[PDB]
Symmetry: D2
Subunit: 253 residues, 4 copies
Amino acid sequence: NVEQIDENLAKFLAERYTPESVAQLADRFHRFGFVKFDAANRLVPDELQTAVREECDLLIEQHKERRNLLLSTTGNTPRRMSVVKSEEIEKSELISTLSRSEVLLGFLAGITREEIIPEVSSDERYLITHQEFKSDTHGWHWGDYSFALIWALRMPPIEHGGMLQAVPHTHWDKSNPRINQTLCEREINTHGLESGDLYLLRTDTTLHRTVPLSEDSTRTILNMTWAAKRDLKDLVGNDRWWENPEAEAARAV
Amino acid sequence: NVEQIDENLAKFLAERYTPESVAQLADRFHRFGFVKFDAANRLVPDELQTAVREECDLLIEQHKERRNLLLSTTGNTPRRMSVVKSEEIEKSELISTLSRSEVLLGFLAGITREEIIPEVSSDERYLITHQEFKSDTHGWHWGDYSFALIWALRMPPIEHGGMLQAVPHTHWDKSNPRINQTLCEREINTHGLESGDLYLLRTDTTLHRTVPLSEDSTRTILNMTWAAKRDLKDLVGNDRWWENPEAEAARA
Amino acid sequence: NVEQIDENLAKFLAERYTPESVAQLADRFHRFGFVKFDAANRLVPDELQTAVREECDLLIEQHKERRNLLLSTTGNTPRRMSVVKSEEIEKSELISTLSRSEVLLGFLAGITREEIIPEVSSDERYLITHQEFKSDTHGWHWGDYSFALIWALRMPPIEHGGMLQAVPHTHWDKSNPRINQTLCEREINTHGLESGDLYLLRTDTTLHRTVPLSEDSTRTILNMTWAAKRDLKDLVGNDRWWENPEAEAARA
Amino acid sequence: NVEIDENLAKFLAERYTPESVAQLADRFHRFGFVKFDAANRLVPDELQTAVREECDLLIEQHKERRNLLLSTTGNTPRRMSVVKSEEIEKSELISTLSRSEVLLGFLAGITREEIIPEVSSDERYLITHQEFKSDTHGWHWGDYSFALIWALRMPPIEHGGMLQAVPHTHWDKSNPRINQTLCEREINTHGLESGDLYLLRTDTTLHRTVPLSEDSTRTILNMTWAAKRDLEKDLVGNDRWWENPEAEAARA
Ligand SMILES: NCC[C@@H](Cl)C[C@H](N)C(=O)O
Ligand SMILES: N[C@@H](CCCC[NH3+])C(=O)O
Ligand SMILES: N[C@@H](CCCC[NH3+])C(=O)O
Ligand SMILES: N[C@@H](CCCC[NH3+])C(=O)O
Ligand SMILES: O=C(O)CCC(=O)C(=O)O
Ligand SMILES: [Cl-]
Ligand SMILES: [Cl-]
Ligand SMILES: [Cl-]
Ligand SMILES: [Cl-]
Ligand SMILES: [Fe+2]
Ligand SMILES: [Fe+2]
Ligand SMILES: [Fe+2]
């Protein structure tokens, strides 16, 4: 505990990354809106992710809420999953502090090529999604903020779905999402994930979803959302379905 | 009717296409496994398309059979639709004679850049699919034969799904389809369709599906399947689900 | 003239663009590091284009300085062309005030999605390149600053080269440019240009060159360079060959 | 050295499966190009050393320099030294290997069609030897479907010589439209190293070699074969510059 986390994380990163290799990651982040931290590009120590995973498994058992809706601001794409709200996750001292770590944010800032600002709406700082059943999905969407760090805490086999599909270099018009038309005009990048992986996502300009589960499995992630200088902007849409299951943009079925 | 159809169709194409313009279409076919005949490049006269659509809506009314299964030889991807079998469609003199037309097959032979042989299995010569419910879909799959001309007879709005997604330059291993693995390695091309469109699909090397309907709509196609010189072989998989809903590879 | 330029350009752009259609251009700029303003998407009135072209054709005949060298900071890619220095172009009140026009910078900031800042080095605010001979080229390189609006004043036919090739989402390591290697890993996008076109380029993250002239033709551009907030840094490399032909990185 | 076919069969059998050849067949269709590097060897080192030693002898004897522009390919240059097919065919090693039913039988798993060694007696083989700056095999297609290129000696990538390719094209000798095709399509740059081999779909892939940025040494061997689509075809163009420097399409 204490400042030993940042001290060991800086060491963990200094053993693995250089400015030259981060710049290559920054190129891939700009090109794909997505950079994956796998066994080839570990981001945090095993002992640290295990601690975050055990914190999230306790939050799921205590505060999971089922969501089964369509979001009108993203072309009525579905949100079929369980969630844990940001206000409940922020109680975790481990998750809240590491999410504001200047060591972590300073490292990822070399990938984004701009400052990562931990000042987002109090209902969207953190998110856990927990999909368990067939057809569970985080439908096509964008984010209100620029940056999200996703912890692929548990992934089903790729044959069961659950991959992240992404279209970079897009934009979110809440009154006219044009999701299926964007797919017709653009190539979809499918990103397979494994348990233990993390990935950085440029959420405001990358249209993305999780491929629906073809079988009852378990797909669990943690979302750390941060702002860019561009997001310091007014929230609109009435579509905060995770914080409010009956938001104005949430539709039945 | 009759041979006046081949003569009229030959005139229809000579007004619109040249070998130079077909050659550019052939390039796109090899690159995408897919070429679309839309309002800017019609394939058949509107009178002829209306005659085929009226024929298919009749066969649907009389011989539709709901399918709701998963196909093991394509990674348990769903087949959630209603179909009309090839043997019932062949009874239509219009569709069967048009599917073996020396004018139509000869013209598309300049896009495929190889001979289009109408020597395919009697249960796969033709197929009509009729999706009408939310989540209805023709899951990811390949074709046993090389060529299929799909008539997009009725397409819902793009915002309701029903697009054709495709991954060209792949191959079908029925013992190990690797569908989701292929998607992770390849970019997906999504092709929107409108009612009246037609498209040619290289079905053996293009992994493809139809995007599931996001609500109750109607999506109706006619499939004309032909072979290349490479398909003149033996079928495998026990997965002919459209003809046999209880095929071995079909699951609930 | 003078203040009427902003009032005229504000009315010109207002009749040809919407926030929705500018957002689509921002996508293409993010995706390719490049967006072209051609006959489909004009940026300036024809009267304004002719005035700027006339100015440049004067500055050419008065300060054209031949450059034939290899720049070590970009893998010794050639620079075979004539140039006109920024300090010389700065004397033109038209080109200088246009580069700082709140209407011009304000509109393009919807494509870059970030503020465009006309605070760059005094030797790189403006540049005119004038390629005239076979094998003349502006070799593979990056820009020291983020943004550049290029005025394709006079382009040869595409059969004579002169197209802009680009690889977006890269970066400039002046100690290890890795140019040909990056080409082996990335798809090269070729952008053909016509006389009167303009294009906004993200020069810092887009590796780009002009295809060498296959024969003695005339290729003339005006380069307006601007900074993003990220550029407000130390110039490095001793490679300012356009202002100093005897630069350290320049192999004559 | 005898009947090589037993030795090559055991070599490939330990390094390939039908499932991994099919993945190469995917890449060959998608890119018109499949490279045999250290990751995927095609011939043993003892055979590569023999083929290389044979060619280096054919060079020192029958090297004619070509410095021309080919009209049927948009006047793209051909600055190199060559050795005609008739001179190369005198090598018992190259000719028997080029017709080996073990080599062809394996590569036909990548092409997915029969590879027929019935091609013109002046285009069976070709050795090109680029040694000076600007030396290049300019943008072009091939009259025949396939070519196995032996990258016997490749300079470092900083000196150029990489193969650039645009798959899913075709050769219109009356209207090549090379630079236009480049403006419409992405260029794939393939870096080669000494000892590499690659299979090229030469009729549908527009390809060239990047000019040597300086005096280096780029040596290749070309084994051109036909597909059934090339059988007994009528060669046209008057552009056989390799066999005939004064060909009708060859411009100085
Ligand atoms: N902005 C005008 C000068 C730029 Cl074009 C120089 C560039 N870095 C190069 O290497 O040619
Ligand atoms: N905007 C997203 C929710 C993200 C919540 C966490 N950043 C959606 O519509 O699904
Ligand atoms: N092979 C396809 C069926 C094609 C039937 C018409 N050619 C599938 O698995 O669904
Ligand atoms: N067609 C090629 C020559 C190939 C010779 C060997 N196959 C060219 O235009 O240069
Ligand atoms: O579950 C995932 O990987 C994606 C989540 C996402 O895009 C979001 O939280 O908005
Ligand atoms: Cl998001
Ligand atoms: Cl099919
Ligand atoms: Cl530049
Ligand atoms: Cl060739
Ligand atoms: Fe998201
Ligand atoms: Fe199909
Ligand atoms: Fe060639």
